[PDB]
Design a binder for this molecule. Structure first.
Ligand SMILES: Nc1nc2c(ncn2[C@@H]2O[C@H](COP(=O)(O)OP(=O)(O)OP(O)(O)=S)[C@@H](O)[C@H]2O)c(=O)[nH]1
Ligand SMILES: [Mg+2]
Length: 315
């Protein structure tokens, strides 16, 4: 049969990454020609990230560790143009490498909640040696890690357990929220994504607004929307990996001042689950099927999607 899945959630919550996983898990994964297409995206994400860290150092008044980096930073901008076209010269690679290793660069990297930085920055920057290689071809994980804002409506098709899925993805930034209603017809289930690690961040499109509060407002409106009464609500509390590392050092009280639990994964995670599940105004009549995920982890997504499928089949 025909199963219509709609991916919803604020910006950078992991929706497009789940879409990519369906291809890796239910199809062949990305072909060589397809991976080479993402080469420019990986290079562009890497360059953007190091530049965002360097922009930040000036704004925050953080000095380089070794004075010599000033020359590397200057050379960065000179050579950056190539990376956008899909080229990574040894010279530019070396420049980014030394900058990334610098103590002040790292100090600023560790204050990223104070500015805007891609989640994949470290992933690409720590793997710079591999991605800068001659004839580099993006791996499945590199593809999964890429970031490109979704404007418009993306539709994907795949067969799974005898069902023909038609998955829809739309942009979550505020400018894109208006396009959501175009997707509202015949939805079998909604997979609402939430970036767990967004609790200490603020909106790219607004400094005054905490990203998790924004996500709760969206969920509240989607979960309780009459149009969606007979649609299954599946909640993916995503980026559980980043959340696991982040909860150790950044207080959850930044997001929920009344949080009284410890700075540990299990306690904090269940607290957030309840915060969202409690927005359901009809607990007795409507169920929310919550799952903790790491969208970039194929094994995790596979087992979770498999469980999600059976729930769609049964209920
Ligand atoms: N480490 C980590 N990063 C993740 C996870 N799921 C998604 N990402 C990353 O976060 C970035 C944003 O995810 P993406 O899938 O683009 O979000 P989106 O909801 O589609 O964002 P938009 O199109 O509305 S602006 C990407 O670099 C992607 O790799 C996860 O669980 N762990
Ligand atoms: Mg997207």
């Amino acid at each position: 049969r025909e199963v219509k899945l709609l991916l919803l959630g604020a910006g950078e919550s992991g929706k497009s990454t789940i879409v990519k996983q369906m291809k890796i898990i239910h199809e062949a994964g990305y072909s060589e020609e397809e991976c080479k297409q993402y080469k420019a995206v990986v290079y562009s994400n890497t360059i953007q990230s190091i530049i965002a860290i360097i922009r930040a150092m000036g704004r925050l008044k953080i000095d380089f560790g070794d004075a010599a980096r000033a020359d590397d930073a200057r050379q960065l901008f000179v050579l950056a143009g190539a990376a956008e076209e899909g080229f990574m010269t040894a010279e530019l690679a070396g420049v980014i490498k030394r900058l990334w290793k610098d103590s002040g660069v790292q100090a600023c990297f560790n204050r990223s909640r104070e500015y805007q930085l891609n989640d994949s920055a470290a992933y690409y920057l720590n793997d710079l040696d591999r991605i800068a290689q001659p004839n580099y071809i993006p791996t499945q994980q590199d593809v999964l890690r890429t970031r490109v804002k979704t404007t418009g409506i993306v539709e994907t098709h795949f067969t799974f357990k005898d069902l023909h899925f038609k998955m829809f993805d739309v942009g979550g930034q505020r400018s894109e929220r208006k396009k959501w209603i175009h997707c509202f017809e015949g939805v079998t289930a909604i997979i609402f994504c939430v970036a767990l690690s967004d609790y200490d961040l603020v909106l790219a499109e607004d400094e005054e607004m905490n990203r998790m509060h924004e996500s709760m407002k969206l969920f509240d409106s989607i979960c309780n929307n009459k149009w969606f009464t007979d649609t299954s609500i599946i909640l993916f509390l995503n980026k559980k990996d980043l959340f696991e590392e982040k909860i150790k050092k950044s207080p959850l009280t930044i997001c929920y001042p009344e949080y009284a639990g410890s700075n540990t994964y299990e306690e904090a995670a269940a607290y957030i689950q309840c915060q969202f599940e409690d927005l359901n105004k009809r607990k007795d009549t409507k169920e929310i099927y919550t799952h903790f995920t790491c969208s970039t982890d194929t094994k995790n997504v596979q087992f979770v999607f498999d469980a999600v499928t059976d729930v769609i089949i049964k209920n």
